[PDB]
Amino acid sequence: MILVFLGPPGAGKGTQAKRLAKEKGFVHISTGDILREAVQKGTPLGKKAKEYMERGELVPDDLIIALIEEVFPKHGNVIFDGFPRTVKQAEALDEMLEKKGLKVDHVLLFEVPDEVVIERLSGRRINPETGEVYHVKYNPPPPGVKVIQREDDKPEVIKKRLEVYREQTAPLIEYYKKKGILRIIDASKPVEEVYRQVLEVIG
Ligand SMILES: Nc1ncnc2c1ncn2[C@@H]1O[C@H](COP(=O)(O)OP(=O)(O)O)[C@@H](O)[C@H]1O
Numbered sequence: 001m002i003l004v005f006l007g008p009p010g011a012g013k014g015t016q017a018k019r020l021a022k023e024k025g026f027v028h029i030s031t032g033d034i035l036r037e038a039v040q041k042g043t044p045l046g047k048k049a050k051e052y053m054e055r056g057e058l059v060p061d062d063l064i065i066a067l068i069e070e071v072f073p074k075h076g077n078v079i080f081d082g083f084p085r086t087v088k089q090a091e092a093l094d095e096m097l098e099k100k101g102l103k104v105d106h107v108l109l110f111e112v113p114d115e116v117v118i119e120r121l122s123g124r125r126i127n128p129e130t131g132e133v134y135h136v137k138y139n140p141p142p143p144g145v146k147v148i149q150r151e152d153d154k155p156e157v158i159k160k161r162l163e164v165y166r167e168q169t170a171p172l173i174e175y176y177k178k179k180g181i182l183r184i185i186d187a188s189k190p191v192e193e194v195y196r197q198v199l200e201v202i203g
């Protein structure tokens with residue numbers, strides 16, 4: 001089974017993907033996590049990607065397409081989490097999968113309003129060593145766990161990221177709808193309820 005998780009930043013895509021991957025044995029491919037590792041390592045990809053990420057812009061498509069070609073799991077279940085982010089990326093994914101006799105089985109759209117997104121992102125904190133994600137209100141880290149706020153989770157960058165999502169990423173809703181594989185999630189609900197909805201789709 002191949003899944004794509006699609007929706008605004010802060011919808012809870014990563015949170016749900018990590019849980020589904022561990023509980024059911026999917027390989028979790030998060031372009032954001034992979035990009036952050038590249039930036040930390042100072043690879044050619046990381047060095048180039050860094051300034052786009054800092055500004056809240058998308059990293060250029062060709063970089064992302066190459067990355068996915070490089071890390072694509074050839075067998076087994078996969079969750080693409082925050083990829084594709086543009087129509088060109090989605091077209092490239094379809095072509096990759098078709099060469100392998102595969103297809104995207106379900107695209108889960110995590111629907112959530114802007115006000116909720118902004119609260120989710122503003123309160124997001126991460127363990128920079130493990131990538132584990134917390135929220136100051138809805139899931140605070142326990143004692144002993146050092147967290148930071150992502151620089152792109154500051155107010156002005158959130159604003160930019162939501163604009164970018166609406167312009168470049170939201171068209172994927174229609175792209176996948178017209179393949180007949182889109183499934184809608186209410187990602188504004190609490191974390192357990194969102195997970196129930198995810199399970200309902202894949203079952
Ligand atoms: N259903 C939810 N209700 C409240 N907070 C949530 C929910 N899902 C995730 N969170 C929190 O909201 C923020 C965004 O979640 P995250 O999984 O990073 O989203 P995405 O991967 O879609 O950007 C994090 O701070 C996370 O702890």
Ligand SMILES: Nc1ncnc2c1ncn2[C@@H]1O[C@H](COP(=O)(O)OP(=O)(O)O)[C@@H](O)[C@H]1O
Nearest residue numbers: 009031032033052053057058059064082083085
């Ligand atoms: N598929 C992608 N295409 C282009 N840029 C990406 C992609 N995935 C992640 N990024 C870059 O990484 C940044 C953070 O993305 P991500 O880690 O998915 O965080 P969030 O869950 O808050 O959207 C994006 O704003 C963009 O700069």
